């Protein structure tokens, strides 16, 4: 059973693919019910499956243009109002912005000298407490956040500009 994006969490401006694998940002807000689990301001969506224990892999195909960030979020990530996109808010992610790849550390993001990215493998380890990112062509390490996760952790996707996308690949 492979991951799919959870439409009930998705910001109403996001457009999810029919197969629930891909996400881009739309030009209008869909008329969707506001549900406590739905991100109402930040351009985020979670997968429908979260993890409380064990080790897990998934892969994310990434657009070549700016606008995306992806990784994992603690389930308690704030859904309502404009919120920071930071580890303190329970978001551990890579981001493409200004033509540069970043690990979204705080208060300053960390630039990654990894070269062009096409698909990224995410390795989540809830037994030791880490989430790691690898570029699939050679499995070169991109970044590892070491976190003592204290709750369920969900795959996280965010697209805040048109002209880029993220897609779960399995």
């Amino acid at each position: 059973v492979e991951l799919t994006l959870d439409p009930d969490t998705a910001n109403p401006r996001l457009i999810l693919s029919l197969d629930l694998k891909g996400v881009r940002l739309g030009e209008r807000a869909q008329d969707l019910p506001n549900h406590p689990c739905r991100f109402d301001t930040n351009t985020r969506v979670l997968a429908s499956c979260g993890f409380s224990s064990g080790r897990h892999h998934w892969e994310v195909e990434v657009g070549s243009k700016d606008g995306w960030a992806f990784g994992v979020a603690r389930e308690s990530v704030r859904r309502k109002g404009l919120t920071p996109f930071t580890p303190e808010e329970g978001v551990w992610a890579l981001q493409l912005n200004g033509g540069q790849y970043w690990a979204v550390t705080s208060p300053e993001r960390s630039p990654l000298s990894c070269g062009h990215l096409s698909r990224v493998r995410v390795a989540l380890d809830l037994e030791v407490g880490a989430v790691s990112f690898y570029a699939v062509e050679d499995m070169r390490h991109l970044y590892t956040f070491r976190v003592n996760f204290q709750e369920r952790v969900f795959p996280l996707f965010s697209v805040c500009s048109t002209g880029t996308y993220l897609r779960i690949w399995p």
Binding site: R44, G67, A69, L82, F85, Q95, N97, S158, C160, S161
Partner: peptide, 6 residues
């Protein structure tokens, strides 16, 4: 600026 909603 363009990423405030990320």
């Amino acid at each position: 600026p363009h990423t405030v909603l990320q």
